């Protein structure tokens, strides 16, 4: 059960819902309802239709907290040395100086 999305308006298309259009070049366009489907058949440009995802994304509308920092990092520092060259004598000679 895949919840598709509207290739014009960008709404979720839950099962058995809306229409599916298979264009000449074999490109599929899934519409959630007749509104997007007619607006599509009208050569309407979703980036000019205020209420669409594609319009909002392009106009940076309401995004707020995605352009807000997060926290996803770590801290490692473990030694393996070199294969064939005693990983033991690679920490004792690794006593360094400055």
């Amino acid at each position: 059960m895949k919840v598709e999305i509207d290739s014009f308006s960008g709404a979720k298309i839950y099962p058995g819902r809306g229409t599916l259009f298979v264009r000449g070049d074999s490109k599929i366009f899934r519409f959630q309802n007749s509104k997007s489907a007619s607006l599509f058949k009208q050569r309407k440009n979703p980036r000019r239709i205020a209420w669409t995802v594609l319009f909002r994304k392009h106009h940076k509308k309401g995004i707020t907290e995605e352009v807000a920092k997060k926290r996803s990092r770590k801290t490692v520092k473990a030694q393996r040395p070199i294969t064939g060259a005693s990983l033991d004598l690679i920490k004792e000679r690794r006593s360094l100086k400055p």
């Binding site: 059960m1 099962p15 058995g16």
Partner: protein
């Protein structure tokens, strides 16, 4: 009360839609418990 849609895997060995999803329409009947308040006895007669 109303109708709605349902998705389920069909189990029909031999059908082109065996083990595939279908969407089917279903009605919903509101069904709160009936309360019993009497019994009625019927006898058979040559007139029914």
């Amino acid at each position: 009360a109303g109708m709605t849609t349902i998705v389920r895997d069909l189990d029909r060995p031999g059908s082109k839609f065996h083990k595939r999803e279908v969407v089917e329409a279903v009605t919903v009947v509101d069904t709160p418990p009936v309360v019993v308040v009497g019994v009625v006895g019927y006898v058979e007669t040559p007139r029914g």
